[PDB]
Design a protein around this ligand. Structure first.
Ligand SMILES: O=C(O)/C=C/c1ccccc1B(O)O
Length: 264
């Protein structure tokens, strides 16, 4: 029997679906795992790793991040509020990356995906950092279908957390790029009701959300700096068996609380 897991099982039963959690305390090595190796749809959470992949490329391309991109209306996608706002001015690669991370801007994400060689190019970047689980197969908005049993556009909570650690705290990015990735995550605007709702107000948090909508499917991953302590990295993913089942931000926050409470 796994007593640590019982509150998570109760939570997912109340929710009406499945919850996957992995959390790592980088100071002690302590972890919390629940369905941590199961696949869940990435939804928009892929956009954080997209931004990291762009940052990695910028390490060999002088001024890539500062390069202006003058996209047209044909690049726009529903829920592209930053891209629409800057349509008449253009945006730099860095601004597109920040929009994808901090507003889940769909047009910005697809524009950057194209620069990287599409979903397979982002998947290849994740392979290059040692992530063998992540797979992106489609673009926005098709990647949100979240069909039960479909492995397209999925990863696992553990693989997400391990890759997030490598990119934000480890050596997968050069230091200036690691810091930029962290800065973008800390400026996210979409996650106030998810992992951020689980952490004490004085702790610093960088996160990236995902919401497929269908099949009760939504998620969040975060790096969390408790004041004066080594950071925690964690991922919380959800799904549900019926297409019209609704996702729950409260369930994501509640799972994150249990993860923080369960850490040594
Ligand atoms: O970050 C979120 O919670 C939502 C992102 C989003 C919004 C509209 C359409 C697609 C997505 B995404 O999850 O792919």
């Amino acid at each position: 029997t796994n007593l640590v897991a019982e509150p998570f099982a109760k939570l997912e039963q109340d929710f009406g679906g499945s919850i996957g959690v992995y959390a790592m305390d980088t100071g002690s090595g302590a972890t919390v795992s629940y369905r941590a190796e199961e696949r869940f749809p990435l939804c928009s959470s892929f956009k954080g790793f997209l931004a990291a992949a762009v940052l990695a490329r910028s390490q060999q391309q002088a001024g890539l991040l500062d390069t202006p991109i003058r996209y047209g209306k044909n690049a726009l996608v529903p829920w592209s509020p930053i891209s629409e706002k800057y349509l008449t001015t253009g945006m730099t690669v860095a601004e597109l990356s920040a929009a994808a991370v901090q507003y889940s801007d769909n047009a910005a994400a697809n524009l950057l995906l194209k620069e990287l060689g599409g979903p397979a190019g982002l998947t290849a970047f994740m392979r290059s950092i040692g992530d063998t689980t992540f797979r992106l197969d489609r673009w926005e908005l098709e990647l949100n279908s979240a069909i039960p049993g479909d492995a397209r556009d999925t990863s696992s909570p553990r693989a997400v957390t391990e890759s997030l650690q490598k990119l934000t705290l480890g050596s997968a990015l050069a230091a200036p790029q690691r810091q930029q990735f962290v800065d973008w995550l800390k400026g996210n605007t979409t996650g106030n009701h998810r992992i951020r709702a689980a952490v004490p107000a004085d702790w610093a948090v960088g996160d990236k959300t995902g919401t497929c909508g269908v099949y009760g499917t939504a998620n969040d991953y975060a790096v969390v700096w408790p004041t004066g302590r080594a950071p925690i990295v964690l991922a919380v993913y959800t799904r549900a068996p019926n297409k019209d089942d609704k996702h729950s931000e409260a369930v994501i926050a509640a799972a994150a609380r249990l993860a923080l409470e369960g850490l040594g």
